Amino acid sequence: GMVGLLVEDTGWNRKAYEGLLNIHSNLDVDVVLEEGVNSEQKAHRRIKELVDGGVNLIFGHGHAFAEYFSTIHNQYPDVHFVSFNGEVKGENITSLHFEGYAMGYFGGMVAASMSETHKVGVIAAFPWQPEVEGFVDGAKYMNESEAFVRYVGEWTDADKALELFQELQKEQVDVFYPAGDGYHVPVVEAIKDQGDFAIGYVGDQADLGGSTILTSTVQHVDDLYVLVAKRFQEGKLESGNLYYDFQDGVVSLGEFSSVVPDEVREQITDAISTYIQTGQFPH
């Protein structure tokens, strides 16, 4: 057990930094981080040093590390490779994925429940984001609020994302789900300003906003890192693409706002528990 982490220039790579930090903290291994790994070239070189130094478990934060690891995981049989998000096939190579639909759904229930205009909205980056569907379905499952979905071209365009906020503003939308790590705060802020409600993204977001953050659709990257580094130690870590959701314990909802009626919570807290055992949504 000696863990390395490859990270590339800016979701939030800080959730990976804290992940590696807890790995070295909650387990007893030595940790090493390589930053600015932006090409197969660099990735391959930094893998040599890492295994030279004696790392035997290497993480890649991001979808491209899977391809990077794939073109090299066979010359390092004695080393296991985990990627965050790619598609991988092999024995000493794994890939991690967070399940998005669920969290979006439950988040959307709170969203709608807390809406005055029965008009909720999602400002996401791309259509393939599960959270977008599950969100709409939540704002339908219980309030039947007309959902507005706007797509930003990408994850870092705070500008456009803010325009989409404004746009939906002029449509009497009052609860927002800005599902893009890159522009999330810029948009949460503008909301707190306007006095509307938002749903946190990937992070607890409560303290970085406040009473404006009804709740947050949280993905525990730091936890998943530790988790995955623990199975690799206990020899029990699978290979290939693994998927995590509310049932695996690394996906949740953030601390509800004081604002949310104590009943709306109970309902969801129960829907979640149900979904954790059943595997189905309140509809």
Residue 281 neighbours by CB distance under 10 Å: 18
Residues 158 and 255 in one domain: yes
Q: Say what the alpha-carbon torsion angle 270, 231, 12, 279 is, to the nearest 10 degrees.
A: -30
Phi, psi for residue 43 in degrees, rounded to 5: -55, -45
Cα three-residue angle 70-75-81, rounded to 5 degrees = 45
d(CA 66, CA 86): 5
Of 132, 76, 127, residue with least CA distance to 104? 132
Residue 29 neighbours by CB distance under 10 Å: 18
Q: Which domain holds residue 201?
A: 101-219+251-283
Q: By the 8 A CB rule, do 174 and 198 touch?
A: no
Of 135, 125, 128, 127, residue with least CA distance to 103? 135
Name 195's Cβ contacts closer than 8 Å, sequence gap at least 6: none
Resolution in Å, one decimal, please: 2.7
Of 87, 25, 114, residue with least CA distance to 242? 87
Q: Tell me the three-class secondary structure of the chain, residue by residue.
A: CEEEEEECCCCCCHHHHHHHHHHHHHCCCEEEEECCCCCHHHHHHHHHHHHHCCCCEEEEECCHHHHHHHCCCCCCCCCEEEEECCCCCCCCEEEEEECCHHHHHHHHHHHHHCCCCCEEEEEECCCCCHHHHHHHHHHHHCCCCEEEEEECCCCCCHHHHHHHHHHHHCCCCCEEECCCCCCHHHHHHHHHHHCCEEEEEECCCCCCCCCCEEEEEEECHHHHHHHHHHHCCCCCCCCEEEEECHHHCCEEECCCCCCCCHHHHHHHHHHHHHHHHCCCCCC
d(CA 62, CA 80): 16
Count of the separate structural domains present in the chain: 2
Residues 129 and 237 in one domain: no
Residues 140 and 68 in one domain: no
Domain of residue 112, CATH code: 3.40.50.2300
d(CA 44, CA 36): 13
Indicate the residue type of 38: N
Residues 271 and 245 in one domain: no
Residues 52 and 187 in one domain: no
Residues 166 and 96 in one domain: no
Of 24, 22, 30, 84, residue with least CA distance to 59? 84
The tokens for 157 are: 């365009």
Residues 53 and 148 in one domain: no
